[PDB]
Symmetry: C2
Subunit: 101 residues, 2 copies
């Protein structure tokens, strides 16, 4: 279990690394995925050995960049149908009004 | 040999990782050490393996 605070992530990952858990499933609002991935990097773990999975349906929303050359796979799950033209159009339109926040 | 700027450095680290060169000596004014180590990190080239 992830402890209460996000930045307490350290021991848990540390135990996982010591125990040599070479697969992981997550389950949490991607907002938690950000914290857990930053730890998973700074703890020197993003290596093509480990191979995460996410059930949070918003991985597409992360910043995949600083991790992408490392060679981990995070198979995930997305439903918002980016494939269709009109869907993407409406995404963009809503985006042009989304950024007022 | 490291290239002119830092961006050329990544193709090199790629070779080091591919051939599995598990040790290194560097040489640079540390100002180069910083960028080369950052690349060393984001390349998945910074673990308990290498030294």
């Amino acid at each position: 279990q992830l402890p209460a605070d996000t930045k307490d992530a350290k021991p848990l990952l540390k135990e996982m690394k010591r125990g040599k858990e070479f697969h992981v499933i997550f389950d949490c609002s991607h907002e938690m995925a950000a914290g857990i991935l930053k730890q998973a990097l700074a703890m020197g773990m993003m290596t093509e050995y480990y191979h995460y999975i996410f059930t949070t349906l918003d991985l597409f929303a992360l910043d995949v960049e600083p991790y992408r050359y490392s060679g981990v796979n995070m198979t995930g799950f997305r439903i918002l149908n980016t494939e269709n033209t009109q869907v993407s159009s409406i995404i963009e339109k809503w985006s042009m009004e989304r950024l007022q926040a």
